[model samples]
Target: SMQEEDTFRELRIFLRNVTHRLAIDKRFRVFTKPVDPDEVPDYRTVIKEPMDLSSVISKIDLHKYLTVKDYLRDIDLICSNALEYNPDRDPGDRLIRHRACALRDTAYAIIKEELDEDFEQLCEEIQESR
Candidate 1:
């Protein structure tokens, strides 16, 4: 049940601390596989450190649905889409925004790690709750 408890905690941190409205422009640029990689500079080049994604993961309810693969794929998609964020008005703030995204991603990984590590704990809790 650590996962369950920590999941709620992460959600509170996410809703309270993380600001989602900061990203500029309502539209997002999409880079498809057919697109030339060289034409667009990979944002990953500027990205640094682990972005915590636990908040995102916490949004999902494992008891309701979703296999591990589904969760991972969804997280990967979020990362890929978030990488395209471009702040033209103020390039200076781009680093911080990207770092925030990276932190969200890192938190997601932590959630995944916690799920795996505490699987047994969860099972035990489920057995007791019923």
Candidate 2:
């Protein structure tokens, strides 16, 4: 239950933040209701009127988008951290490595699109940086 609650909260925040960002991207402006064209909209303000929170999340398929993004970010961070600071080789480390690989594969499958170019590029950059 705690895990479910944490996940719900995390997704809510992620969706709200991404909605705000998407609103700023002129391409998605048509989906959001009119705000002051010059003034950037905040999460609270943007999720009103023609585009409520639910609509915003639905319009963007927030769950899948975030799952893919978070997974990629997690994998990148895991690699970066392991490279910079090796943890003592132990069962815990082995378990984490196993989980990370599982997550990476699952995330790739969950992403409905033909893999995001930006996500691929980010992973590559993170790998190269190490």
Candidate 3:
């Protein structure tokens, strides 16, 4: 059990890092629900609502509306699926890697869209509530 704990602990760290990294370029606002500091940093807990990439795609300042929409949907699935991974039960290395790859790809796609909109400067005009 201790070994499992350690493995989970490492996984948690990876997820946290991914969460924070994705947070910067996320298509939705993030909210940290009330929780004790001792609690592990779970993005689902903080992000209360899933990122609405669909809406963002429509409202987003980009020409590729449909692509963004699909990408956002995939991102949502990728993240939610990742959270549901049961470390106790082998979800299989292949499946986990596939999910991870999908998440990264979708996240980067969104980021790339943003970059395309404006490489002139960084935009801090973030949506704080969605």
Candidate 4:
């Protein structure tokens, strides 16, 4: 119980740091609200599940993420969806793609810096069968 609880708090803190940093940065910050077909022409077809930083924060409150992957996957979806839906040919989309990539880089960078070194060594033996 103790170890598990301690680690969840560790995970929560790392996630909060990522969101806060990005939310504050002007170049990289994105809208926290959800997007829909009204805003994007093909949002329904292009995105099955939608997420934003607001969604991330709400889920964080709900304890929806059991691991870093669970949390990071949602973050990836937001940027990945933006880039995919936006496409690169247009100058407008190019901006979103660039910033999306930047968000990914920053989020991952925070994950690396904040998670413990031994947690990586811990990653080595986690699962091979399942």
On TM-score, the candidate that comes out on top is 4
**Residue-wise C-alpha lDDT for candidate 2, range 1-130, written one tens digit per residue:** 4644454455446445644543454333333443343664452343333222235456445443334354345334433333233245787656545544443354345443545566446444543554
Show where candidate 1 strays beyond 4 Å: 1-65, 87-93, 117-130
Alpha-carbon RMSD, each predicted model:
10.9, 19.1, 18.2, 3.1
Highest lDDT against the true fold, candidate: 4
lDDT per residue as tens, model 1, 1-130: 6766665444444332322321221322221122334774564465432222343334443432223343445445555444544545576457545654664466466565545545545544544575
lDDT of 1: 0.43
Across 1-130, the per-residue lDDT of candidate 3 in tens digits comes to: 4644453344334334434555455332321122224654674564454443333333333422223234345456545544553233455645555555555575666455543343112111211111
The better candidate by lDDT, 2 or 4, is 4
Q: Which ten residues in a row have the lowest lDDT in candidate 1?
A: 25-34
Please, what is the TM-score per model?
Answer: 0.32, 0.29, 0.27, 0.80
**Candidate-wise lDDT, in order:** 0.43, 0.44, 0.41, 0.74
